[PDB]
Design an enzyme around this catalytic site. Structure first.
Site, mmCIF file in Angstrom:
data_model
loop_
_atom_site.group_PDB
_atom_site.id
_atom_site.type_symbol
_atom_site.label_atom_id
_atom_site.label_comp_id
_atom_site.label_asym_id
_atom_site.label_seq_id
_atom_site.Cartn_x
_atom_site.Cartn_y
_atom_site.Cartn_z
ATOM 1 N N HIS A 78 0.805 -1.214 0.000
ATOM 2 C CA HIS A 78 0.000 0.000 0.000
ATOM 3 C C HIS A 78 0.841 1.268 0.000
ATOM 4 C CE1 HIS A 78 0.718 -0.244 4.419
ATOM 5 N NE2 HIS A 78 0.686 1.072 4.314
ATOM 6 N N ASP A 106 0.308 -7.916 1.873
ATOM 7 C CA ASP A 106 0.546 -6.476 1.760
ATOM 8 C C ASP A 106 2.047 -6.186 1.692
ATOM 9 O OD1 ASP A 106 -0.139 -3.709 1.685
ATOM 10 O OD2 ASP A 106 0.247 -3.576 3.842
ATOM 11 N N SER A 211 4.892 2.714 7.612
ATOM 12 C CA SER A 211 4.489 1.607 6.757
ATOM 13 C C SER A 211 5.640 1.177 5.856
ATOM 14 C CB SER A 211 3.282 2.011 5.911
ATOM 15 O OG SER A 211 2.190 2.393 6.730
#
Length: 1006
Positions: A78, A106, A211
């Site tokens: 993402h 992910d 992230s």
């Protein structure tokens, strides 16, 4: 990105950027509170190297991506929004050209356009997605984290506070062990509890922006750090990482490799054709044909990588190739050449360990060849190569052949980074030395017997190395210039009647008066209103060449700043530094290791100093408390009318030769810092004054200093060497200055400043005198034995006087011999002869009985200090002339009053002689006299007489006078062997109403 508020925040940043006390490899790092108490120890594993994570990701926060293969990075799926990212320094930018998404998790990998040379790719763990393999008490014993998301701090009460980041930076720390879920494909840990000791002493909770940040774990069986996860999501209690598996991370690199090219030794040379339009080509050998792809249109990702196998393979490029992002990897020794002048450019070249590749194809202007791999690449093209080299690993030998017309150039510029690689120069025509660049962590430049000349040293950090390992001595000339005159443009503008919009420092030419002027402002008034002003114009000479030079000198001077070199100068090299343009100052905060090499400075200032510790986000300052010690090992430092500073945290070993009024300062306060130190930018010189408080941070010197022609020497901190001074000045203010070798002072002044302490273990020679100022201690001592501890060896010292000021102390002890008179005047000096301490110096030299006469120290001068104390302990004192002292406390010593023929005197107010021996000469009518005025003490003293003429039967010569009422048994006659017989004076004592006296009256014989 949320960390404890009770720990100094700078720790979490130094841990992140591997700065401060967190350099890779360091073990057992203690972690302390803001108040100073111990939180925990980083002892479970050595410090990891986080350089594989991005220092900058453009619009994305730092730490988003992590290098795991020379050309590929890993991140969370993402994460998106940036195609450029940096490694090492923020400037070292790379471009992404392709992405591979995991269909079920992910996580995703991305391909870069070129091979990253500044850092080493991270090692991916062999385990992969095994349920519970990352739990506590398992294979992994420590977990480190790095990221640059939204930064917070949190105290024990739970109050969170945001951190002022200004632009955004990396913060790291530890996390707990990890439980597995989703069939072991992902791992989680309760990191929300910052103060749970299971999360480690540097517990991290990851917020928005972290992230895709890496997660490292130390494998306790393979004993190395490995990458295990990238951050995907979080919750109020912990974080969740996607397990990085070699199965998926290797998918994109494998799909970008064409079929392996296996060179068959017997068959023909590999012919390489390439259709540049539509990006397809072929490599044929015999009856086998290999496909190869390159850049197609604007898509750099269309190019695919090539693997070369076989031994001593040959490849010929029949067409120019732009392989885009595709790179060449060689698993064996290979030779590659062009056919007509064809060029190759692409992702780069990997040379595997123990392989040698002969590269004879040129590059392309504007492109840099990125070389990595532990192997060796020998560049052997012909002509000039318009293009660059970026090396990050292995060895690159520059051996470019001359053109048919003589032109030669291996590369337009070279860049050495990561500390891994080494670049070797065949001859001195390979690269312009000013285009050589050392980047993040630097590397080795091997001169290989060649001579180079620099006008700038583009060295990023301490990793920059300039060496010569050949037997031919290299001579580096550092003619550093901040602004070369050749690169200055001086147009001759005209003074307009009405108005002027211009820049300062510009040349203007007035048509009427025909004069030249230098503009001082941004504008000048019309109608010649401001010409004959003196603030907006600066007049220069009428000659057209003369004025332009003055402009060029003003630009050079204004653009000038002190010079600094952060790298190392090692090996078989001589370094020559002339008078530098502009500010003639050069400071070195790196290493120097020239065992047989010399460094020369002509005029100006040269500075050896330690390096202040670089912290994350901060700029170094001379006011810092923590410095790195730097070693400057030379054979000989030559100074020619220059000034040399050995500043704090600098340890030097080598001789210094100063001449023509040079100034040597050992223990100087003058230091220099770099505003852009640790950033990779150009040097910004700042002059400062730094003084080390504790020892070990103070400068330390060892070697012999030679001074000639009105030169200077100042010894302010620890010193251990020798001096050969001729018509020069030496000043000693240090408190632990020791003369290791001989101290010679021909028409030179040795002055011990107030509070200084100097001990010469190898004798002093001075045509002049030595000056010992207030509270200063001078000590002469025989050469201590290297083999036996506490044993010394007698050494003679000759001086034409020793001057003691008030409270000064001069001592001769432990096999010291000195022929020099001492003067103190009315001041309260202290002369010490012999060693006061028990277990004093011993010796095995036969000079103990021959030269020392069995005593611990010898003095052949005369003491002239009516208000001074002389302490003798097993010492010998020849008093050549008349001597005066305030007090004299001698124990088991000897004193010989007279000279030859001429009769001297010894006048002391207070005498306290125990077991001492006194010796006088007599012509039977006059003798050397000992005179006590105020007080006498001691017992068991012997007195010897030396009769120049034959001894008379009856005489009346006064030898000693003591205060009235002194003991008459203090002095007793002593037998002396004369002429195969024993002669012994007889001393009668006469008490008087003024003074008690010892009188010689006759002798004895047998």
């Amino acid at each position: 990105a949320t960390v404890s508020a009770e720990i100094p925040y700078q720790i979490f940043r130094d841990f992140a950027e591997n700065k401060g006390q967190f350099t890779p490899g360091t073990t057992n790092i203690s972690i302390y509170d803001k108040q100073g108490n111990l939180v925990g120890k980083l002892d479970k594993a050595p410090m990891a190297d986080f350089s594989s994570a991005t220092i900058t990701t453009g619009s994305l926060p730092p730490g988003d991506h992590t290098l795991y293969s020379p050309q590929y990075v890993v991140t969370a799926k993402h994460v998106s929004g940036s195609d450029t990212m940096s490694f090492g320094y923020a400037k070292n930018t790379y471009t992404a050209v392709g992405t591979n998404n995991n269909s079920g998790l992910d996580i995703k990998t991305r391909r870069l356009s070129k091979l990253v040379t500044e850092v080493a790719p991270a090692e991916v763990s062999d385990i992969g997605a095994v349920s519970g393999a990352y739990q506590a008490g398992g294979r992994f014993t420590e977990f480190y984290r790095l990221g640059g998301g939204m930064q917070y701090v949190k105290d024990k009460n739970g109050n969170r506070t945001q951190v002022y980041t200004n632009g955004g930076f990396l913060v790291g720390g530890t996390v707990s062990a990890l439980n597995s879920y989703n069939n072991g494909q992902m791992i989680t840990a309760q990191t929300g509890d910052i103060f749970n000791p299971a999360n480690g002493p540097l517990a991290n909770y990851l917020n928005m922006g972290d992230s895709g940040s890496p997660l490292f774990a130390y494998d306790s069986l393979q004993k190395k750090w490995v990458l295990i996860g990238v951050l995907s999501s979080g919750t109020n209690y912990g974080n969740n990482w996607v397990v990085t598996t070699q199965d998926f991370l290797g998918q994109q690199p494998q799909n970008d490799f064409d079929k392996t090219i296996a060179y068959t030794s017997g068959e023909g040379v590999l012919q390489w054709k390439y259709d540049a339009a539509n990006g397809t080509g072929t490599l044929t050998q015999g009856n086998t044909t290999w496909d190869m792809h390159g850049k197609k249109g604007n898509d750099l990702n269309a190019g695919k990588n090539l693997l070369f196998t076989g031994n001593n393979g040959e490849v010929v490029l029949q067409n120019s190739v732009n392989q885009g992002a595709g790179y060449l990897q060689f698993a064996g020794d290979y030779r590659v050449s062009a056919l007509n002048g064809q060029t190759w450019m692409g992702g780069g070249i990997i040379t595997d360990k123990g392989t040698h590749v002969l590269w004879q194809v040129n590059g392309v202007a504007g492109d840099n060849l990125h070389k990595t791999g532990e192997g060796t690449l020998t560049v052997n093209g012909t002509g000039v190569n318009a293009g660059g080299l970026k090396v990050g690993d292995g060895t690159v030998i520059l051996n470019q052949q001359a053109d048919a017309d003589g032109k030669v150039q291996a590369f337009s510029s070279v860049g050495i980074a990561s500390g891994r690689p080494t670049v070797v120069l065949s001859d001195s025509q390979q690269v312009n030395p000013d285009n050589i660049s050392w980047g993040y962590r630097g590397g080795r430049l091997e001169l290989n017997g060649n001579n180079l000349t620099f006008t700038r040293l583009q060295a990023a950090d301490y990793g920059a190395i300039i060496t010569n390992n050949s037997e031919k001595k290299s001579t580096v000339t550092l003619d550093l210039q901040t602004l070369k005159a050749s690169d200055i443009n001086v147009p001759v503008n005209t003074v307009s009647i009405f108005g002027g919009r211009g820049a300062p420092g510009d040349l203007y030419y007035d048509s009427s008066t025909k004069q030249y002027f230098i503009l001082k402002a941004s504008s000048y008034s019309p109608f010649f209103s401001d010409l004959n002003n003196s603030s907006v114009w600066q007049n220069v000479g009428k000659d057209r060449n003369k004025a332009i030079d003055t402009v060029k000198q003003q630009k050079i001077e204004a653009s000038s700043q002190p010079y600094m070199y952060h790298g190392q100068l090692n090996g078989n090299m001589d370094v020559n530094i002339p008078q530098l343009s502009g500010k003639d100052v050069l400071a070195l905060d790196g290493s120097v290791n020239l065992p047989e090499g010399s460094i020369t400075k002509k005029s100006g200032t040269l500075i050896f100093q330690g390096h202040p510790v670089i912290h994350a986000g901060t700029t170094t300052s001379s006011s810092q408390s923590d410095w790195e010690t730097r070693q400057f090992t030379l054979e000989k430092l030559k100074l020619d009318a220059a000034t040399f500073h050995l500043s704090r945290n600098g340890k030097m070993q080598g001789d210094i030769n100063a001449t023509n009024g040079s100034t040597v300062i050992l223990g100087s306060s003058r230091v220099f810092t770099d505003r852009s130190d640790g950033t990779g930018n150009a040097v910004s010189s700042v002059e400062g004054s730094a003084t080390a408080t504790t020892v070990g941070d103070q400068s330390d010197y060892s070697g012999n200093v030679t001074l000639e022609n009105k030169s200077s020497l100042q010894i302010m901190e620890r010193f251990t060497g020798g001096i050969e001074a001729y018509d020069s000045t030496v000043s000693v203010t240090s408190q632990n200055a020791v003369f290791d070798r001989v101290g010679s002072f021909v028409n030179s002044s040795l002055t011990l400043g107030k509070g200084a302490k100097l001990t010469a273990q190898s004798g002093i020679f001075s045509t002049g005198a030595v000056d010992v100022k207030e509270n200063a201690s001078l000590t002469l001592t025989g050469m201590p034995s290297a083999q036996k501890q506490g044993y010394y060896s007698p050494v003679i010292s000759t001086t034409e006087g020793i001057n003691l000021e008030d409270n000064a102390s001069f001592s001769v002890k432990n096999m010291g011999y000195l022929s020099s008179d001492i003067h103190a005047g009315t001041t309260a000096a202290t002369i010490n002869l012999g060693d006061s301490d028990a277990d004093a110096g011993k010796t095995d030299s036969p000079l103990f009985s021959s030269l020392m006469k069995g005593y611990n120290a010898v003095l052949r001068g005369s003491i002239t200090g009516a208000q001074s104390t002389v302490n003798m302990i097993n010492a010998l004192w020849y008093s050549d002339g008349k001597s005066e002292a305030g007090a004299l406390k001698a124990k088991g010593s000897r004193i010989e009053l007279g000279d030859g023929k001429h009769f001297a005197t010894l006048q002391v107010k207070e005498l306290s002689a125990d077991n001492t021996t006194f010796l006088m000469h007599t012509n039977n009518s006059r003798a050397d006299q000992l005179n006590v005025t105020d007080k006498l003490s001691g017992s068991n003293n012997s007195v010897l007489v030396d009769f120049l003429n034959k001894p008379a039967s009856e005489m009346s010569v006064t030898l000693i006078t003591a205060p009235k009422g002194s003991d008459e048994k203090t002095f007793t006659a002593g037998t002396q062997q004369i002429g195969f017989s024993n002669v012994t004076p007889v001393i009668s004592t006469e008490k008087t109403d003024d003074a008690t006296k010892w009188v010689l009256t006759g002798y004895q014989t047998t």
